[PDB]
Amino acid sequence: PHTYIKTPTYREPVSDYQVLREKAASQRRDVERALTRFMAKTGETQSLFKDD
Amino acid sequence: ALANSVTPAVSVNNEVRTLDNLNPDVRLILEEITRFLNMEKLLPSYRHTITVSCLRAIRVLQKNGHVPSDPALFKSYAEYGHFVDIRIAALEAVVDYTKVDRSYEELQWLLNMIQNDPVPYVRHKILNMLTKNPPFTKNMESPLCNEALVDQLWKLMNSGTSHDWRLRCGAVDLYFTLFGLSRPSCLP
Questions:
Q1: Chain B residues inside the 8 Å CB shell of A39
Q2: Out of B18, B19, B35, closest to residue A36 by CB
Q3: What's the further remark here (chain B)?
Q4: By the 8 A CB rule, do B147 and B188 touch?
C-alpha cells in the first residue's frame, strides 16, 4: 500500500452527550468563578469571616 | 431549596464561626449563593428575585451557627436604594436579627427608619414586620423593656405618626403586641 495508496484521515470526534454536558458545565462554572473573583478583587468587598 | 437544606451547626464551646469549623456542606451552598448574588450585581433578574432569595438564604445560614451573626450586610441592602423588594427582604432579616440577638441599637435603627424614611410603604412594612416577628412579647422579660422604649413607642403613637393614618394604626398594633392592653408592666 505505501507505494501508491492514499486515504485522508481525520481527528477523533467527541460526540458524547455526557462529556459535552460536563465540558459546557465546567467551562461555565469556571468562567463565572473567574469573573466574580475578578470583580470582587477590583472593587469594594465584603466577607463572612475576618479579612477573608 | 438550598436554604431549606440548612440544618443547625454543631458549635463546640460557643466556638467563633471561622473557616476551620465551616461545614463541608455549607461551603458549597455559600459558594453558590455568593456566585448568584455577585452575578445578580452584574446581570440583574426580574424583581431582583435572586437578591431576595440570596438575602433570605444568608439569613437562614446566620440563624443557624454557620455565618457570623452580623447585620451589616442587610443594613447596607436596606439603605434607601435597593429594590423595594431588596429593601423589605433586608429589613425582614434585620427584624429577625434584632429578635434573636436582642439588639438595642438595631431596634433603635428600625424605629428611626420608621420615623424618617422617604417611602411610606417601607415604613408601614417595617411596623408590620415588627408586629409579626416582635422583639419581645408581653410575657417575656427582655433587656429591651425600658421606660425609654415605652416612652418612644407612646411618642410614636401620639405624635410622629400623625400624618399617615396607617403608621399610627401600625404603631398601635406594635404597642399592643409588645405591651398589651393594660399599663406597660416594665415601668415605675
A1: 38, 41-42
A2: B35
A3: PubMed:9418870 was unable to show an association between TAF2 and TFIID.
A4: yes
One-letter amino acid at B118 equals: P
Q: Could you tell me if B91 and B71 are in contact, meaning their C-beta atoms sit under 8 angstroms apart?
A: no
Distance CA B144, CA B184 (A): 13
Amino acid at B166: R
Residue type, A39: M
Taking alpha carbons only, the member of B31, B40, B112 closest to residue B67 is B31
Question: How many angstroms separate the CA atoms of B64 and A16, rounded?
Answer: 43
Residues 6+ apart with CB under 8 A from B62: B68, B69, B70, B97
Mention every residue, 6+ apart, whose C-beta is less than 8 A from residue B141: none
Q: Do B21 and B65 form a contact (C-beta atoms < 8 A)?
A: no
**DSSP letter string, B18-60:** -GGG--HHHHHHHHHHHHHHHHHHHS--STTHHHHHHHHHHHH
Please tell me the distance from the alpha carbon of residue B56 to that of residue B86, in angstroms, as a whole number: 10
Question: How was this one solved?
Answer: cryo-EM
* Resolution as reported, in Å: 3.7
Cα atoms in the 13 Å half-sphere on the side-chain side of B127:
26
